[PDB]
Amino acid sequence: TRKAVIGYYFIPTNQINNYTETDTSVVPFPVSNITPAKAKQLTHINFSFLDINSNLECAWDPATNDAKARDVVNRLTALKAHNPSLRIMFSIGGWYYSNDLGVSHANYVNAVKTPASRTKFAQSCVRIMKDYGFDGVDIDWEYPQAAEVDGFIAALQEIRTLLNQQTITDGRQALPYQLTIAGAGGAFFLSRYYSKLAQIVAPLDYINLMTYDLAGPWEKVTNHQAALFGDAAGPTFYNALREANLGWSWEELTRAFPSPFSLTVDAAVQQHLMMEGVPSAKIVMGVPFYGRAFKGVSGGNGGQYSSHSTPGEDPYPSTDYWLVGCEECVRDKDPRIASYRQLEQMLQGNYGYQRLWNDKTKTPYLYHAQNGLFVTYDDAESFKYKAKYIKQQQLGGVMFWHLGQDNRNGDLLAALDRYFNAADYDDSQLDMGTGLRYTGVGPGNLPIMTAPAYVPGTTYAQGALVSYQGYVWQTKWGYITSAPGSDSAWLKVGRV
Amino acid sequence: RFXXX
Incomplete structure (x- = not known):
């Protein structure tokens, strides 16, 4: 569908x-x-x-x-x-x-x-x-x-x-x-x-x-x-x-x-x-469809995971619009956020931004070597x-x-x-x-696993696996003598 | 988010 x-x-x-x-x-x-x-x-x-x-x-x-x-x-x-x-x-x-x-x-x-x-x-x-x-x-x-x-x-x-x-x-x-x-x-x-x-x-x-x-x-x-x-x-x-x-x-x-x-x-x-x-x-x-910006960050990892000096105070203090190139930020009075439209334009400008890519998170980010700025976006x-x-x-x-x-x-x-x-x-x-x-x-x-059917009256040691009530169970400790769902010693770890 | 949004 x-x-x-x-x-x-x-x-x-x-x-x-x-x-x-x-x-x-x-x-x-x-x-x-x-x-x-x-x-x-x-x-x-x-x-x-x-x-x-x-x-x-x-x-x-x-x-x-x-x-x-x-x-x-x-x-x-x-x-x-x-x-x-x-x-x-x-x-x-x-x-x-x-x-x-x-x-x-x-x-x-x-x-x-x-x-x-x-x-x-x-x-x-x-x-x-x-x-x-x-x-x-x-x-x-x-x-x-x-x-x-x-x-x-x-x-x-x-x-x-x-x-x-x-x-x-x-x-x-x-x-x-x-x-x-x-x-x-x-x-x-x-x-x-x-x-x-x-x-x-x-x-x-x-x-x-x-x-x-x-x-x-x-x-x-x-x-x-x-x-x-x-x-x-x-x-x-x-x-x-x-x-x-x-x-x-x-x-x-x-x-x-x-x-x-x-x-x-x-x-x-x-x-x-x-x-x-x-x-x-x-x-x-x-x-x-927008990114968030930080100022006063440090280089070393492209601005990622750095300490910063960005006012977390909501109604952005000062009329200090540090987000270079972001004209929209001026219009909306906040340099900590910008639309993808504006960001694209900041990138094609010469405002000193470098687009980097993190291959673990699979997301891009901008780093302004000067001014020390970092922007996370998609x-x-x-x-x-x-x-x-x-x-x-x-x-x-x-x-x-x-x-x-x-x-x-x-x-x-x-x-x-x-x-x-x-x-x-x-x-x-x-x-x-x-x-x-x-x-x-x-x-x-x-996860699907597979295990023998629990046998009433049987004693199982620690780590044993068994099937019951449509599920697979494992013992949390040793010398178990009661049944799954009826003995806290069993942990439901799988289905079918 | 998270007051501006």
């Missing part, structure tokens, strides 16, 4: 109110930039972002000029005339609105609190969907805390029920209304709801892993923000998942969650696959490995943040589409390398 290619499309409320397709200084990336050729390369466009107001219902930002909004949305839905598989989803949330200290956080916690609030919220979701002409709902709450998870799950189940009803009522059997969420792409935020992943993913068509922002000025040493695989020379992190309320034994926790570990895209994907009831087909790998080359990985692991597809950051020729989007569907692209020889793989093993990814 075709791999999903989900592009978030974000347009600031101020750009909506001043929408125009003839002045890039007002609207850098209007919808017209999405030609029919590009509409065909996408399977989903996630319009971002809608919020949840005080009436605990899905709603546009109060400052939004509604007529301008519908006009922009209508331009997006008009693109469906060029691609019968394309869906224009709308995303509820985002960091600004939903983070713990976000301007609308309480509305999220309250919307999912009760059956009544959940029914009211779900109905507003479907209402907004049919009202503006969207094709599905994406929930991007960053992020629900463990105590709000059961409500979160129930809310998703309710939206699922209403959407399936709407699909029938609207004869959309060919292009069913969908439900997805942007999920965490790193163990720390993932730990908030990890124990209930199976319940969270059940009502979804896809869980879009935000497998980016895994590095940034908020960390001590520079690092790749979306390394596919790990580099032993880079920093490692505490595996927060081992502290999840899973109810697993020490032995199970340790094998599923090695710590410290390399915070990579492969780690996030494997961490989801380790849980039972989380199908590979629903996992979507997120990739960034490009068409890193997307080759990520696309091959998506195919090998049988993931549902790729997602990205965000469409408006691609270059004018739409090279990053074209590359993703090419790697998945071009008849003349052949990656059978692409070498995935020796970067560190996340080796955690859990209930959802037990």
Whole structure:
């Protein structure tokens, strides 16, 4: 089946109110930039972002000029005339609105609190969907805390029920209304709801892993923000998942969650696959269409893993725009982030940047020998490995943040589409390398092994293997006399 | 992310 290619499309409320397709200084990336050729390369466009107001219902930002909004949305839905598989989803949330200290956080916690609030919220979701002409709902709450998870799950189940009803009522059997969420792409935020992943993913068509922002000025040493695989020379992190309320034994926790570990895209994907009831087909790998920059770094390894002097303070202090060549950074008042479009232009300039490649993480990075600058980002080359990985692991597809950051020729989007569907692209020889793989093993990814059937009344020594209840077991110590699942001395290590 | 985003 075709791999999903989900592009978030974000347009600031101020750009909506001043929408125009003839002045890039007002609207850098209007919808017209999405030609029919590009509409065909996408399977989903996630319009971002809608919020949840005080009436605990899905709603546009109060400052939004509604007529301008519908006009922009209508331009997006008009693109469906060029691609019968394309869906224009709308995303509820985002960091600004939903983070713990976000301007609308309480509305999220309250919307999912009760059956009544959940029914009211779900109905507003479907209402907004049919009202503006969207094709599905994406929930991007960053992020629900463990105590709000059961409500979160129930809310998703309710939206699922209403959407399936709407699909029938609207004869959309060919292009069913969908439900997805942007999920965490790193163990720390993932730990908030990890124990209930199976319940969270059940009502979804896809869980879009935000497998980016895994590095940034908020960390001590520079690092790749979306390394596919790990580099032993880079920093490692505490595996927060081992502290999840899973109810697993020490032995199970340790094998599923090695710590410290390399915070990579492969780690996030494997961490989801380790849980039972989380199908590979629903996992979507997120990739960034932007890079993160660090200043005051040291050479030696191209700027990688160096200490730096980048204000991790969000609303970038000073008007000191140290990110040379990045005119966009000036426009947006922040030299710590730049779109691939801007980065490409900085590279072809003579701003003193050198593009290097890390063959372990399979990602590029820029090093400014002078000024001491380092930029972690992704490009068409890193997307080759990520696309091959998506195919090998049988993931549902790729997602990205965000469409408006691609270059004018739409090279990053074209590359993703090419790697998945071009008849003349052949990656059978692409070498995935020796970067560190996340080796955690859990209930959802037990390996096939083979073992004799456990014999009741028999005593086995330490290390013995046996089959029982459709699984293969190993003894954690010696002189065992009870049965698997009935004696803590046995560790389930394989299936069939 | 992670206040700007």
